[model samples]
Target: GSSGSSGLRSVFVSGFPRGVDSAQLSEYFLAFGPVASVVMDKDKGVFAIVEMGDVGAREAVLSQSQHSLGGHRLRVRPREQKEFQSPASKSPKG
Candidate 1:
């Protein structure tokens, strides 16, 4: 099981071309291993989440942190888990 329970390892990649799309990003990761999925960060011009077949594939991509893609220096790293907190749960009504 390469992907583990999640069936994929999410990685954050940056330094892409200004308008690079999800397909383009997936193509780049496919070279290392089977890319499970890809999602571009709309808020950021050069940021995306590349889901690999498994943890091994994710490691392979991370190992090659500085790689060239679309003539830009691509930076790849593990996606950080975001902490979620509901506002309603935090403060009590006065």
Candidate 2:
């Protein structure tokens, strides 16, 4: 199942409270495993990337992420590399 990748697992978490910082986000996911890293998006949206210690830990987080957190419904899923250009990145003149 690892596909020979290093077995590292990453997930995207959204719908976090605007006031919730990276430390708080790490704390929430630490219950699943030792958090490798946490990165928050700066552009007006409340979202973050949580890198777990391993794939199992990632799965655990996914299982519990589909619930309310800080009065907002949280969205969580396995992180995937985006190969296509986003609309924002497309050239407007084209």
Candidate 3:
């Protein structure tokens, strides 16, 4: 593998059913591999960040064109590089 080669270990997941939580989401991915962590957007309960211990795990989830939970279709995407980076505050403090 070259230095330029990169694999995403994190994913952006959305569209889970209303009652879904981190534990359920983590379990959903257990078939593929161990999930390192699951962080739900409290403001937007339908979205979450899932970190997997293996890059292949991420690929496995992304391989499928469709994923579902509790009759709701799920959407998955590779977490963008910038998403993990700090967002510089543009607005000055009053």
Candidate 4:
């Protein structure tokens, strides 16, 4: 189900400890709602993009935070489009 408009629907879950698989990542967010997909390196560092089946899942996560896995605090929010610059735009800088 789409939002019936044009916009980015992915949410960013940052500050979470690494070492969880894409499979393990879903469970944490599943408590909130349907998780569309997760983008993250299987090993090393932190930060993850948790795409929700619905755009509203962003709001669903609102007021629900301070998430912790093994005492690590997590910060969750909507992914900013500016976070990823388009190739065309970067060519101007490089």
Candidate 5:
């Protein structure tokens, strides 16, 4: 609540197994809210940007320390729309 930019309804998730796809990420977040969209980058440490209906919804999900998927746990943090626009963070740009 102190970082400002609460207008966005999204989160950045990392530490999930690289094997999980957008669908899997969506599934994991379903417990918290309706997932509007998911962006995945697998080559790195396996991260996904998940967007929901509202920030409060996302905040509930972020309340947890880490989410478990298979044999791993994930870290979640608030994500800005601008963070997703970096070219270096993209895949094929197609």
Candidate 6:
């Protein structure tokens, strides 16, 4: 039996040019569709979590198989379930 697919609308992106900001990164992916949010590592030249407008947008990006920005190849993949998190909040002491 087949089952319905479940995936996040967020994707992981890495291997972009150093010093790139969220806006710049989001702009590149605009070719596929709108981006809801782009979160980059504070201390990592590293990677980012790009939240697409919808599941279709997310798939459109992954379907292309290749992406680049400023001559640096990009690595884009589906976000893991565990990666999704709620806003941080301090716990109350009893």
Q: Considering every candidate listed, which one attains the maximal lDDT?
A: 6
On TM-score, the stronger of 1 and 6 is 6
For model 5 the local lDDT of residue 53 reads: 82
Root-mean-square deviation per candidate: 8.4, 9.4, 9.7, 8.4, 11.0, 9.9
TM-score of 4: 0.63
lDDT by residue for model 4 (1-94), tens: 1333336667877776546666777787888788988887556646678888876665576547456655667676666545654555334554
For model 5 the TM-score comes to: 0.67
The models' CA-based lDDT, in order, is 0.72, 0.72, 0.77, 0.68, 0.74, 0.80
lDDT of each residue in 1-94, candidate 1, tens digit only: 2333343477887767666788877887788999888877677556677888877888787677467776777777677557375655466788
Tens digits of per-residue lDDT for model 6 on 3-73? Answer: 22446778898777767899989998899999998899897558889999988888788678567887788
Which residue pairs clash within candidate 2?
none
Taking all chains together, each candidate's TM-score versus the true structure is 0.65, 0.65, 0.70, 0.63, 0.67, 0.73
On TM-score, the leading prediction is 6
Clashing pairs in 6: none
Ranked candidates (TM-score, high to low):
6, 3, 5, 2, 1, 4
Clashing pairs in 4: none
For model 1, the superposed segments whose C-alpha errors exceed 4 Å read: 1-8, 43-46, 80-94
Model 3 earns a TM-score of: 0.70
Count: clashes, candidate 3: 0
